[PDB]
Amino acid sequence: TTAQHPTDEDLLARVLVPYKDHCKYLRSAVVTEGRAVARCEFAIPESCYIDDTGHLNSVEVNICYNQMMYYLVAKSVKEGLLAGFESWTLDDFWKHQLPDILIARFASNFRRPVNPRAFSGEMEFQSVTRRAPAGPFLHAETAYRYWDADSGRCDGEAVLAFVNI
Amino acid sequence: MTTAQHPTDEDLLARVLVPYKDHCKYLRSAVVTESAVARCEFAIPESCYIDDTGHLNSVEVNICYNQMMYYLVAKSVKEGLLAGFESWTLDDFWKHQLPDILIARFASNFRRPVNPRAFSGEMEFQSVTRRAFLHAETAYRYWDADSGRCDGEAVLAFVNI
């Protein structure tokens, strides 16, 4: 009885346009419906910036979060799922995506190393708050976690700003 | 205060950067002092994973931190500057660099978006401790020639010692 959306493959490819061809890590994303959640699968067959370390690096946790978060937002804007984004169209999203979606704060905590080859993740929008000072942006709080098929596990938080809204 | 500052060790730096891809070498200079601390300059002429967003991204803060941190450890090993690492040689460092130097926790706070084309940073090792691996608490910050400001902390684990 909770509404869910399977991976919207067309939207996903378009969300991932700004990322390089060899950097498309987000493979699937089921979005559950006013503060939405994404449940995702990831794969990094080789790193984009460094020789193989043997584990999912902090850097990659962050790249993957960005992908998952952009997808969650885009899909939420498309299906009207996210409180605070009622006025947005998908066109607004493509315009804002790169210059106007900012990370104010990022944290990652590794409990145990994760396998970068195949891993799962999830995130939640915990609050979205609009600000329009006399003379203008959304403030958002999110949490995520990652795990794999063995015992890998990482969790964290990110505070976002959506400016020029 | 008094201890001598080590200018950028260019040969060590280039070697520390070998595992990074050719377009992802952002750390351009790094002065090391005991207090161990590194004071660094960085340049990202273009991003390695995404089209230009116009500001230094959280991802890049993290890449640059890793480069700075690896160089500070390597240089500290070479020069005997970090307690906990007294027994290490550079050859130990090269063996551990990728598989055995882990981030346990990373945080960044972006006060003011930073210019990715030219910016500065610093970090410090606050504590190193054996635990039943080596556990290190570190803090860093970045700034630029305008009003850019990012800061954070990273907890590291050095394993298989």
Ligand SMILES: C[C@H](CC(=O)O)NCC(=O)O
């Ligand atoms: C020391 C770091 C660990 C990590 O980022 O999680 N690996 C090297 C790199 O990812 O740049």
Ligand SMILES: C[C@H](CC(=O)O)NCC(=O)O
């Ligand atoms: C939403 C982020 C902002 C950032 O990482 O700081 N830009 C997209 C990216 O860097 O993947």
